[PDB]
Symmetry: D2
C-alpha cells in the first residue's frame, strides 16, 4: 500500500494576516518568493506523492491559478525572452503531478475538510498537510513520515515536543514510546489545559491516514455549525487499530502567526542564493530608527 | 485645481518574485500583513486623494477582490464573531473612497498604462503611484508632493539622490535648484550611463501630473510592442511648461527586488505593535544554523 | 457637447432566470450567439459613444472577461488556425473603445447605480442603457436618441406606447408633442395605476442624461433600503430645465422576463445569416410531440 | 459494481457560438433558464450518479461558480426575501452530490480529456457525458444506459439512427442486435464516408465505460497534436471484452451548433411551466416583420 495522494486544506482565513488575506487564503502567503502551499506540495512530492488534492474555500482562484497553467503569464515571459523563468513557472506543477480541486462550502474545520475529499481519495492511504505549518527537514518531514508508514502500515500523526504551558494550543497525544521517535498512541486530546495534558507531544499539521478514517469521521455527531473534529476521529480510530505518533526531526515555523511568518521569512532569506549575503549584511548594519 | 485622483499601475509581473507572482501581481505582495498596493492607496488617501484608478493586467482579480466588498469573507468574520477584524476589512476601502478599474491589455510599460487611464482622469491633475516603491514618510510622500503641487501648480516628479554608479537603473532629472528640495527641471533622461548622467537625482515611483501629459503621451511614436516611455512625454512636456522635481524626505524600499522586500518586511515588522518586541528578540538570539 | 460615455448597470440578479444567472448577470444571457450587454454596447457605439462604464455587482467577472482580452481563447483560436473568428473576438472591444468598471456593492437599484458612476462621468452628458431591454432599431435606438440630444441639448428619456392596463409596470411620462415623436415633458410618475396614469407612454431602459441629474439624485429621500428612484430625480429635474421623452422607432424585447428573452431569441435567429433560413423551416415543419 | 461517477468534459470553445462563448464554455449556454451542463448533471443524478468530475479548460470559473456555493447571490436572495428561489439555488448541487475539478491544460479532445480524469475515477466504471449533446429522455438517457450496464456489466455506447448521408459526422458502430435496442458491437469507425459506413448507428455524447478503457487510451498512437481518439480505444477494447451500443429512446439536440441550440430552446420552452402556453401562442400569432 503506497501513498500517492495528499490532501491540502487551503481555505485559511488568516485573521492574524488581515488585510493581506482579504483576497487570498493564508496558505498563499509567500515566504521570500514562494507561497506556503507550494512549499507544502514540494514536501509531498519529496515523499513520492503525485496527486495533490486541494480543499478550497473563499478566494479559491488564488490557489487554482497558482498551480494551473497560465497562458497569459507564459505569454508575458515568452514576450520578454525569459527562458529560465519560463521553466521555473512550468515546474510549479511538473508533468507527472496532478492537481484536483474540491470545495469545502462552509469553513467547518479540518475534519470536515478531510471528509470532503473522501471520494477523491477512495480506498487509499493519504497524506494531510497543513501548509501554514512550514517545515524544514532533511529529508522533508512528509518523506520521513512516509518511511514510517511504509514500515508499519499504520496511520502516522506528526508530533513535536512543545512547552508544557502551551498545551491548550495543540492536540496532545498519549502512548508508549516504541522505537526512536515512534509512539504507539493510546489516545489523543484536543487542547488540554496544561495541568491535565497527558504529554508534551503536540500535533503538527502533518498526517498519513489510512482510509478507515473516513468511516470514523462519518460516525461523528457534528457540532453547532456542523464541525467535525479530526482529533475525535483519530481517537475513535486508535480504539480499533494501531495509530502511531512520529517525532519528526526538523524545524517548524508556525505561519498561522505573524511572528512565525517573519521568522520563516528571515530563515529562508538567509538560505536564498539571490539575497542571503546582502540580507545578512543588512541585518548586521541596519539603523534602529526609521527616518520619515 | 485640486488633485482628487490617483493612477496605480498594478500589472506587475514580478519576475524577481516568481513563483509567488504566478497568480497575483507584485503589487499584491504583503509587507508583514498588508499588500504593497494598500500601503500605496493609504499614502494617496493621506494626500487627500479619494478616487483610486487601478490599471490592471494579468491576475486582475487579486487586486479587484482586495479592494471590492467580499460577502463571503464578511460572512466568515461575522460567523466567528470577530468584530474588530470586520471593521479592519471595511477600512480597506472607506466609504468616501472610490475604486475604478481599467485594463492595460498588453504589458507595454508605464506611459501606456497612464494613457489607458486618460478618459477616467479627464481634464484634471492626477497622481501616479508605483506601489513597488514602498515609501515611509512623515507626512507621507504623496502628501508632501501634493503640498508642492498646490503651491506651484506644476507637475511634480518625485526624486531621490542615488549612487552615481547606478544611474543606469533610473530616470535622471536635470535642472536648477529653486527652493529647498525643489528643482525646476530642464530635462529628464531614461537610464543614462554613469559617465553621462546629468545628476544623481533618480526618479522614484511618485508623480503629480497635469492633464496636458496625455497630449504628449499621444504624440509619441511607440516602440516595437507599442511601448510609450513616460520619460519621453515628461521631456516633451517641460519644453512647454514648468515641471518640478521634488526631493522627498523619507525612506524607500525597492520592493521590485527581493532584497528591498526583505528590508521592508524587517523594518515594518519592527514597527508593528503585534510582533515588534518578539521579532527584535528573535533577531537578537537566532541560531545561525537551520536544523533539518 | 457630445455624448461620449454610456453607463451600463449590470448587477442584474435575473431571479426570473435562475439557475442560469447563478454565476453570471442576466445581462450576459446570449441572444443566439451574443450576450445582451454586447448588443447594448454595440448600440452605444453606433451612437458615437466610445467610453463604456460598467456598474457591476455580483459575478462581475463574467462581464469583465467578456470585454477584456483573453490570451487563452486567442491561443486556442490560434492553434486551430481559425482566422475570421479572431477578428470577431477582437471586435468585442475595438481599439477606440474604452471599458471602465465601477462597483455597486449593494444592489440598490438604477438611480443608485447611476450615482455610483458620477465620478467616471464627470461634468458630461451621458447615456444610460439597461441591456435587459433589448432594442432593435434601424438606426439603433441610442443613435436615434443622440440625434435628439444633439438637436435640443436636453436630457432624453426613451419611451414607447404601452397597453393602458400595464402602466403599473412602467414609469409614465406626461407632456405635449413638439416635433414628430418628441414630447416636452411636464411630469413623470413611477408605476401609476391604469385608471390614474397620465398617458400610455412608458419609459424604457434608454436615457441620455445631462450631469445636473446627479444633484437631483442627491436631493432625493432614499428608499427604505437606500434606493434612489431615478424617476423622481427626472421629475425634479424637469422643474428646472427641459426634459424630453422620445418615442423611438423599433422593437423592444423585455429580457428581464423569460418570455421576452424567448421572443428575442426567435426574432434575432430569424435575421441571423447562419441559421435564419433553416430555423424558419424548422418552425414551419416541427412536430408538436417531443419524443422521450 | 455500481456506477457512481460521471466525467463531464467542459472545455468547449464553442467557435460556433462566439462571441457568446468568449468568457464561458459552450456547456454553460442556457436552455431557457438552465445551463446545458446542469441538464447533464441532472441526467447523471437521475441515473444514481453522485460524483461529478468536471474536466475544465478555458474559463473554468463559469463552471466552478455555477456549481459551487455563492454567498453574494444568497445574500441578494436573502435581502429580497425570495424564498423558493433559495431551494432552487441550493438544488444546483444537493448535499449528497460531490463536484470535483481537474484541468485539461491543452484542448486535445475527448479521449485525452477522459484520460486526464483517470486518477479521479480510479478502478471504477464511469459515465462520460458531453453536455452539448442535450438529450431529452423519459427516463433520462444516462438512466437508461445505467440500467443496461447493470444488466450486462459491459461498457455501453449511446447511439442513434442517423441519415445515411451524414455518417462522416459520427462515430459509427457495427454489430448484431441482442435484445431490443442493444447491439453487441463487432466494430466502431470514426467518421466513415457514407458509401463505406457499416451502419446508420451514430455515437452520441453518452458513454458508460469500464476502467479498462484507460489502458486502451494509452495504447493509442497520439494524433499530431497529442489527441487520443476515443473511438479507436473503444475499437481496441471490444477485441478483448464485450462492448454494447444502446439505441436510446428520446430526442437529441446538437447544441454544438447554433441551429440545434435554437431547436432545443424552442422545444424546452414549450414544456416549461412558466412560459409554455404563452410562447406557443406567440409562435402562432407572431408577425413575420420586425419593426425597426
Amino acid at each position: 500500500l503506497k501513498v500517492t495522494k495528499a490532501v491540502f486544506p487551503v481555505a485559511g482565513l488568516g485573521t492574524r494576516f488581515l488585510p493581506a488575506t482579504k483576497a487570498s487564503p493564508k496558505e498563499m502567503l509567500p515566504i521570500v518568493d514562494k507561497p506556503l502551499i507550494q512549499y507544502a506540495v514540494e514536501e509531498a512530492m519529496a515523499a513520492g506523492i503525485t496527486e495533490m488534492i486541494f480543499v478550497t474555500g473563499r478566494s479559491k482562484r488564488a490557489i487554482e491559478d497558482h498551480f494551473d497553467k497560465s497562458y497569459e503569464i507564459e505569454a508575458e515571459l515568452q514576450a520578454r525572452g525569459k527562458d529560465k523563468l519560463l521553466e521555473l513557472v512550468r515546474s510549479i506543477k511538473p508533468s507527472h503531478v496532478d492537481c484536483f480541486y474540491v470545495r469545502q462550502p462552509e469553513a467547518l474545520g479540518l475534519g470536515h475538510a478531510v471528509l470532503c475529499a473522501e471520494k477523491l481519495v477512495g480506498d487509499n492511504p493519504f497524506a494531510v498537510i497543513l501548509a501554514d505549518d512550514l517545515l524544514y527537514g532533511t529529508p522533508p518531514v512528509m518523506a520521513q513520515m512516509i518511511e514510517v508508514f511504509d514500515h508499519y502500515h499504520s496511520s502516522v500523526i506528526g508530533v513535536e515536543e512543545i512547552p508544557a504551558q502551551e498545551t491548550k494550543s495543540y492536540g496532545i497525544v498519549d502512548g508508549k514510546e516504541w522505537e526512536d521517535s515512534i509512539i504507539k498512541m493510546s489516545g489523543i486530546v484536543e487542547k488540554p489545559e496544561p495541568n491535565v495534558a497527558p504529554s508534551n507531544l503536540g500535533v503538527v499539521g502533518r498526517y498519513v491516514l489510512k482510509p478507515r478514517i473516513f468511516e470514523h469521521l462519518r460516525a461523528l455527531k457534528p457540532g453547532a455549525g456542523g464541525e467535525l473534529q479530526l482529533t475525535d476521529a483519530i481517537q475513535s480510530l486508535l480504539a480499533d487499530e494501531q495509530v502511531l505518533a512520529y517525532k519528526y526531526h526538523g524545524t517548524r515555523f508556525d505561519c498561522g502567526s505573524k511572528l512565525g511568518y517573519l521568522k520563516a521569512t528571515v530563515e529562508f532569506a538567509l538560505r536564498h542564493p539571490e539575497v542571503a549575503a546582502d540580507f545578512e549584511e543588512y541585518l548586521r548594519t541596519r539603523s534602529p530608527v526609521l527616518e520619515g
